[PDB]
Design a protein around this ligand. Sequence first.
Ligand SMILES: CCCCCCCCCCCCCCCCCC(=O)N[C@@H](CO[C@@H]1O[C@H](CO)[C@@H](O)[C@H](O)[C@H]1O)[C@@H](O)CCCCCCCCCCCCCCCC
Ligand SMILES: CCCCCCCCCCCCCCCCCCCCCC
Ligand SMILES: CCCCCCCCCCCC
Lengths: 276, 100
Amino acid sequence: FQGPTSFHVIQTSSFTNSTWAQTQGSGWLDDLQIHGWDSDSGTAIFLKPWSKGNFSDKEVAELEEIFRVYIFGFAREVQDFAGDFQMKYPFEIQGIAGCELHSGGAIVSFLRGALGGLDFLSVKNASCVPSPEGGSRAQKFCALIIQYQGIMETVRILLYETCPRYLLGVLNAGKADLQRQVKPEAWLSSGPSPGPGRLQLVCHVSGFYPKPVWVMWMRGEQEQQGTQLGDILPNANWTWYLRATLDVADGEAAGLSCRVKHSSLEGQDIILYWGP
Amino acid sequence: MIQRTPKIQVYSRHPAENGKSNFLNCYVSGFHPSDIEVDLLKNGERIEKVEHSDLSFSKDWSFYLLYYTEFTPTEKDEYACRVNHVTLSQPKIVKWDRDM
Ligand SMILES: CCCCCCCCCCCCCCCCCC(=O)N[C@@H](CO[C@@H]1O[C@H](CO)[C@@H](O)[C@H](O)[C@H]1O)[C@@H](O)CCCCCCCCCCCCCCCC
Ligand SMILES: CCCCCCCCCCCCCCCCCCCCCC
Ligand SMILES: CCCCCCCCCCCC
């Protein structure tokens, strides 16, 4: 099966001062967003009609409540123990947590935390693993967090029981959009000239789904090694964008072609040649 | 508490054909902290209806966001992406180059 194999919720908590703290969250399936979070109301925004997965409106409201009290309690205790931890305002805490499916049936769960854009903690099989990037602070946190059994148990239930029970529900419920195959469209252009006698050959690929794609600049059946691949930029219609460049001399541009391989093409590759 | 400057990529969803409808995009990535102000310009002046993704971050914890709008490109109509971040002294303007 193709498409996304993981689910994760993210958290960004901006602490401005001792009594000012904002939190931003969302649920993702790989790079694709399926949940949004309305901070004020404390409720989830369901971006797709299948965003609930196989879960009931009771099961989803129970979860909304858990996150809501967490977002409050997290902010409350960080504002309380900031001086104790020698924290300098303003600072930002980040957190990603979820699970993923592997070929064979196994589901591995994860939870990583951050402070100042650097790793703070991690969760390797029911226990807090402090990162050396967090230093003494991280050790001081994991040693404190284990003493609160009530919150440690609810993290364990969420991560190792609820998360996989969820993943399969959405992967199945969203089969139609997630395992969809949208065909790419390609075009060529001459970018900004690097050398006075050189030329920048640009190959554009866009409008495709899923994410895996192969794009190279060719010379018949011989690929060019100096082919600089761009970043896989998004489009809000759940499709992608990719650039493939080549710095070449004026006379060498002729004979060169761009080749695009994608899963929706089914062997029928897109080969586009440079016209003199 | 580190400070990283946003990488700014301006691109159209479909190839530029004068008079035809298209989508203009500005992808800001690799920044830290999150607090950011991004605008999409039309000949120097900001566009009204611009949608943006909710806050997200990549593996290395740096933040990323996509700003888009359904536009119609013509001959001399110049477009750009204006960005304000703590690392920048003055707002950074990156023009939309059709041939790039
Ligand atoms: C569909 C979704 C699937 C996705 C799953 C993946 C997401 C996982 C989310 C995890 C967060 C999720 C973190 C857990 C959620 C926090 C809620 C909670 O259990 N806490 C109660 C603790 O009391 C609770 O009172 C309730 C009402 O009387 C009872 O129903 C509960 O049984 C009882 O535990 C109070 O303390 C209020 C909460 C305030 C505490 C602040 C917590 C901040 C520190 C947590 C940092 C976490 C890292 C530690 C490392 C662990 C090893
Ligand atoms: C199907 C249920 C719908 C709910 C989904 C909506 C998104 C929820 C947003 C809240 C995310 C919070 C969890 C993040 C993981 C914990 C981070 C650890 C913090 C590190 C401490 C230094
Ligand atoms: C980095 C700041 C430390 C935060 C301390 C967390 C304490 C959790 C208390 C839970 C309430 C029952």
